[PDB]
Design an enzyme around this catalytic site. Structure first.
Site, mmCIF file in Angstrom:
data_model
loop_
_atom_site.group_PDB
_atom_site.id
_atom_site.type_symbol
_atom_site.label_atom_id
_atom_site.label_comp_id
_atom_site.label_asym_id
_atom_site.label_seq_id
_atom_site.Cartn_x
_atom_site.Cartn_y
_atom_site.Cartn_z
ATOM 1 N N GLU A 7 0.821 -1.203 0.000
ATOM 2 C CA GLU A 7 0.000 0.000 0.000
ATOM 3 C C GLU A 7 0.861 1.261 0.000
ATOM 4 O O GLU A 7 0.584 2.209 -0.746
ATOM 5 C CB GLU A 7 -0.927 0.004 1.210
ATOM 6 C CG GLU A 7 -2.031 -1.061 1.158
ATOM 7 C CD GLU A 7 -3.078 -0.785 0.055
ATOM 8 O OE1 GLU A 7 -3.001 0.263 -0.620
ATOM 9 O OE2 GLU A 7 -3.942 -1.652 -0.193
ATOM 10 N N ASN A 56 -7.697 8.622 -5.764
ATOM 11 C CA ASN A 56 -8.487 7.626 -6.475
ATOM 12 C C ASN A 56 -9.315 8.268 -7.598
ATOM 13 O O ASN A 56 -9.598 9.473 -7.600
ATOM 14 C CB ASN A 56 -9.401 6.890 -5.488
ATOM 15 C CG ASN A 56 -8.650 6.266 -4.355
ATOM 16 O OD1 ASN A 56 -7.612 5.650 -4.566
ATOM 17 N ND2 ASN A 56 -9.140 6.455 -3.128
ATOM 18 N N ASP A 89 -12.358 8.243 -8.184
ATOM 19 C CA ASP A 89 -13.629 8.838 -7.789
ATOM 20 C C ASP A 89 -13.470 10.167 -7.069
ATOM 21 O O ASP A 89 -14.485 10.752 -6.672
ATOM 22 C CB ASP A 89 -14.432 7.848 -6.933
ATOM 23 C CG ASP A 89 -13.773 7.524 -5.586
ATOM 24 O OD1 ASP A 89 -12.747 8.137 -5.199
ATOM 25 O OD2 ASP A 89 -14.306 6.621 -4.896
ATOM 26 N N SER A 112 -11.788 10.497 -4.166
ATOM 27 C CA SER A 112 -11.340 10.241 -2.835
ATOM 28 C C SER A 112 -9.821 10.106 -2.859
ATOM 29 O O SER A 112 -9.193 10.055 -3.924
ATOM 30 C CB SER A 112 -12.024 8.998 -2.288
ATOM 31 O OG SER A 112 -11.535 7.854 -2.950
ATOM 32 N N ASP A 116 -6.434 8.151 -0.630
ATOM 33 C CA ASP A 116 -5.933 7.134 0.294
ATOM 34 C C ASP A 116 -4.746 7.710 1.071
ATOM 35 O O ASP A 116 -3.866 8.340 0.480
ATOM 36 C CB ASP A 116 -5.481 5.894 -0.476
ATOM 37 C CG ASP A 116 -6.624 5.052 -1.008
ATOM 38 O OD1 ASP A 116 -7.801 5.279 -0.680
ATOM 39 O OD2 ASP A 116 -6.316 4.110 -1.757
ATOM 40 N N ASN A 123 -9.000 5.193 3.095
ATOM 41 C CA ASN A 123 -9.692 5.956 2.056
ATOM 42 C C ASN A 123 -10.677 6.954 2.665
ATOM 43 O O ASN A 123 -11.479 6.599 3.537
ATOM 44 C CB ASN A 123 -10.414 4.974 1.122
ATOM 45 C CG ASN A 123 -11.020 5.625 -0.099
ATOM 46 O OD1 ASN A 123 -11.324 6.804 -0.117
ATOM 47 N ND2 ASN A 123 -11.243 4.812 -1.136
#
Ligand SMILES: CN(C)CCCN1CCN(Cc2cccc(C(=O)O)n2)CCN(Cc2cccc(C(=O)O)n2)CC1
Ligand SMILES: [Cl-]
Ligand SMILES: [Cl-]
Ligand SMILES: [Cl-]
Ligand SMILES: [Cl-]
Ligand SMILES: [Cl-]
Ligand SMILES: [Cl-]
Ligand code: NA
Ligand SMILES: [Tb+3]
Length: 129
Positions: free
Chosen positions: A35, A46, A48, A50, A52, A59
């Site tokens: 990650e 991301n 969309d 959002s 992380d 998220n």
């Protein structure tokens, strides 16, 4: 902070992640490797909108507030920036909430695709735990 592998293992253990919801410590170290590459300051946007955050790439769609993810929740009740600290307490407590949701560690796509089903104990080999 960029943790060492055994350094992160020891810290995750102290905060009670080892065997949390049945996931051995090596699962969490593997997830963190892929990650964030053990970097508490890692951030990634991301598709969309959002973002992380942190060692476990938590998220903003659900778990933390960053002020720029419309319609999202803040279920860990924390600013997303708290997940970037050198002290992983906030990330670990939030991760516990995440993994307690119905999907377990599948919530971490990199765990699913790169850790699940592999020899995850290798990630804690040689660590003085
Ligand atoms: C794949 N997705 C990207 C994961 C998002 C999982 N959540 C989606 C909607 N979630 C409700 C929901 C509906 C149906 C399936 C699932 C699920 O598989 O967890 N969750 C809202 C609640 N939030 C935390 C929470 C706290 C306490 C209990 C529960 C729970 O009982 O599910 N959940 C988790 C976000
Ligand atoms: Cl490594
Ligand atoms: Cl927001
Ligand atoms: Cl919320
Ligand atoms: Cl720490
Ligand atoms: Cl599970
Ligand atoms: Cl393990
Ligand atoms: Na949010
Ligand atoms: Tb849910």
């Amino acid at each position: 902070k960029v943790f060492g592998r055994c350094e992160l293992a020891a810290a995750m253990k102290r905060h009670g992640l080892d065997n949390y919801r049945g996931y051995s410590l090596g699962n969490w170290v593997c997830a963190a490797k892929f990650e964030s590459n053990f970097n508490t300051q890692a951030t990634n946007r991301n598709t969309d909108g959002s973002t992380d955050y942190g060692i476990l790439q938590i998220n903003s769609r659900w778990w933390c507030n960053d002020g720029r993810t419309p319609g999202s929740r803040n279920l860990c009740n924390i600013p997303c920036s708290a997940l970037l600290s050198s002290d992983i307490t906030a990330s670990v407590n939030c991760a516990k909430k995440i993994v307690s949701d119905g999907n377990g560690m599948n919530a971490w796509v990199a765990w699913r695709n790169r850790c699940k089903g592999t020899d995850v104990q290798a990630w804690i080999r040689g660590c003085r735990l």
